[PDB]
């Protein structure tokens, strides 16, 4: 199938162009709307003709997902379609991946896969261990959280996007309490210092080698508070919810291994 | 489809790249030919095309043996011979994308010869086995020594169609002292000699334009090696070992 090879080729090229984070560009304010907390994103596996933006206000008591037709439509207008999820989410760490929205069920360790076209829950899984951050990079679906197994320290888990089974789990040394926002680029989890004030990326955990090291990659916090910061492997950019603002960070990568 | 299948393979191979860390014990594929020669398979060949190309001698020969597959090559002496328009020199030939790239007899002339049409597609002279052509995950290469470089090995990235020199690197390694050499993921590995206890002890990364001396031993099973080339498709070192056809498995990192 031609459509299949084009998917495998695109995925391969993204992995081939993988690097380690060295620089974060200046943010471009996409839109100014919503409350203090929230999330906005696009589907990294969406077809070329699919540039839809998915938008979710708040980190609690909300079932409604906004669907904008395009990126330009999301900037200049407010014409969107409201989707009512069967369950409200918790936190701002959900992702739209391959036509489905993956989110954390309100006040629970339960991860839900919800098909946005069929309007149907496809899978439901509890970790039994924004408390849970779901994210996607060049390698697939991820889950970032914390356990009492660790000393409250951040935990990474690779998830099968269909069965939602944990494929592999990593222990980190970074305590979630002192953790700002986080994002995974090319299998390596980057952790920021805080949510408010001046923000920098000062922690990096490579999952391929199970090693961590302390870095220092500054990026201006254009506004007071950052409630979401997620990486999109297709755009090679950082999606951010910045205190009622939707901002985009360009990203540069340098590496060979 | 067929184009995407090849673009996917080219991408997957590049993704699995890494610097050489090990060379396994060789496997004797066949015992034939004179003391010098070269044998290979087209890295950009379809899955149904497992043909083995065979070139006996290093001086004034113009006949290439074509075996239908690895099986027919290993277990049979049934082959069809191709007559090249010009004799080659040395054992630094490569069969790339249906064409044989060889150095014209006693010259700096590289000839691209399509084996199906039996025609010469391109002919180019360089500035200067004197010229060794090889293929890795990145395409076609030319390795030799120049006059500007103090007899040191010189790498040139070639355009497989126009035989144009895209980029040139000058190593710090004298070709006279050099044994056989091969390119893996844009890095020239140079052996210590053709005979005795052989080992890879020089690696030049063309990407960073840097070099480092190493120590990667491998079994020179039949004492003398006149050909040693890397094939990015099956990730193995092809070798003409003193009238013997051998294969080395390679581990990267
Ligand atoms: C994303 O989801 C699509 C389906 O929406 C997957 O497409 C399937 O691809 C396989 C072969 O790769 C086919 O056998 C299936 O029939 C396809 N599904 C459908 C419904 O046609 C695609 O593989 C998914 N991609 C990832 C990375 O999970
Ligand atoms: C993450 O860390 C916890 C604790 O640091 C690990 O749990 C330990 O597991 C070992 C055997 O694997 C036991 O001997 C210890 O008694 C456990 N300690 C605790 C406090 O539970 C856990 O296995 C680690 N997981 C991963 C994936 O690294
Ligand atoms: C190997 O040879 C084939 C055949 O000539 C090349 O295929 C050509 O690909 C280009 C674009 O990639 C097309 O425009 C041509 O029509 C193709 N040729 C034919 C005959 O269909 C292929 O590109 C070559 N590969 C390399 C690496 O040189
Ligand atoms: C290089 O390694 C490959 C894989 O280990 C070898 O291919 C295997 O050959 C054995 C026979 O001893 C088979 O049982 C395996 O099934 C083969 N593997 C595959 C993936 O088909 C290959 O023979 C080795 N070649 C050399 C020259 O060492
Ligand atoms: C990122 O850089 C690209 C290339 O110049 C540009 O097209 C794009 O608008 C930039 N995006 C941001 C958010 O700066
Ligand atoms: C070595 O290569 C560099 C890079 O192109 C070039 O400037 C220099 O002249 C070369 N030296 C010799 C001796 O070839
Ligand atoms: Cl990767």
Residue numbers in the entry:
A (entry chain B): 210 to 338, 353 to 480
B (entry chain A): 211 to 338, 353 to 477
Task: Quote from the publication.
Olfactomedin-1 (Olfm1; also known as noelin and pancortin) is a member of the olfactomedin domain-containing superfamily and a highly expressed neuronal glycoprotein important for nervous system development. It binds a number of secreted proteins and cell surface-bound receptors to induce cell signaling processes. Using a combined approach of x-ray crystallography, solution scattering, analytical ultracentrifugation, and electron microscopy we determined that full-length Olfm1 forms disulfide-linked tetramers with a distinctive V-shaped architecture. The dimer-of-dimers architecture suggests a role for Olfm1 in clustering receptors to regulate signaling and sheds light on the conformation of several other olfactomedin domain family members.
Crystallization attempts of the full-length protein yielded no crystals, so we used limited proteolysis by α-chymotrypsin as a crystallization aid to remove unstructured regions. This yielded diffraction quality crystals and a data set to 2.4-Å resolution. The structure revealed a disulfide-linked dimer of β-propellers in the asymmetric unit related by a pseudo-2-fold rotation of 178°. In addition to the β-propellers, a segment of the coiled-coil domain (residues Val211–Leu225) was visible in the electron density. Cys221 in this coiled-coil segment forms an interprotein disulfide, covalently linking the two β-propellers. The dimer contacts are exclusively formed by the coiled coils; the two β-propellers are not contacting each other directly. Cys227, the first residue of the β-propeller, forms an intraprotein disulfide with Cys409 as predicted; this disulfide bond appears to close the β-propeller fold and lock it in a fixed orientation with respect to the coiled coil. Hence, the two β-propellers in the covalent dimer have a 60° angle between each other, resulting in an exposed outward orientation of the β-propeller top faces. The olfactomedin domain of Olfm1 forms a five-bladed β-propeller similar in structure to the recently solved olfactomedin domains of gliomedin, myocilin, and latrophilin3 (14–16). Remarkably, all glycosylation sites are located at either the side or the bottom of the β-propellers, whereas the top faces are free from glycans and completely exposed.
